[PDB]
Design a protein around this ligand. Structure first.
Ligand SMILES: CC1(C)CC[C@H](CO)N(c2ncnc3[nH]ccc23)C1
Length: 167
């Protein structure tokens, strides 16, 4: 039993809700919140920009030190950093950005990072400003993640379309 509330159950391990991931994280304070990161951990917009703003830019400061030490992530890769005031940990995961020409096949590799954590709060990878089809992203999530994932979908219209079209 966990403190996630109001989710629709899609499968044995995947749950979905129309919610702002920032507000969800502040309420639940989960062990792991997933960020829709880029390889440089530049948290300028979308989910990443919103999460960073909620940390008063502490996420960006930590991220800049991480990159200075380690260099950029791989597309499809991830790193674990602090969750600041939002969660214990933040799993920064890089899904392919279709608006940069990146291979959508890497979306499965991106979701595989979730399997290293027993429970996560997460957005749909590569959705929003990353330019991928969110229905497809949900399909890959369900077919790849085996741990317990609680998906927050910000757009209410998009949430209803994902539920109604789910197979
Ligand atoms: C374009 C979106 C409405 C759809 C998919 C992603 C990840 O779920 N989106 C978010 N989902 C949940 N919380 C969020 N906060 C800021 C953006 C955001 C944007």
């Amino acid at each position: 039993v966990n403190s996630f509330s109001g989710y629709l159950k899609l499968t044995d391990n995947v749950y979905i809700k129309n919610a702002d991931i920032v507000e969800e994280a502040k309420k639940v304070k989960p062990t792991v919140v997933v960020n829709a990161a880029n390889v440089y951990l530049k948290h300028g917009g979308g989910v990443a920009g919103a999460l960073n703003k909620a940390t008063n830019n502490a996420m960006q400061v930590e991220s800049d030190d991480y990159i200075a030490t380690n260099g950029p992530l791989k597309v499809g890769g991830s790193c674990v950093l602090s969750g600041h005031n939002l969660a214990k940990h933040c799993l920064h995961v890089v899904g392919p950005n279709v608006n940069k020409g990146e291979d959508i096949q890497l979306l499965k590799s991106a979701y595989e990072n979730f399997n290293q954590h027993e429970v996560l709060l997460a957005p749909l990878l590569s959705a929003g400003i990353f330019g991928a089809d969110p229905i497809h992203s949900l399909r890959v999530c369900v077919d790849t993640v085996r741990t317990n994932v609680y998906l927050a979908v910000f757009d209410k219209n998009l949430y209803d379309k994902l539920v109604s079209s789910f197979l």
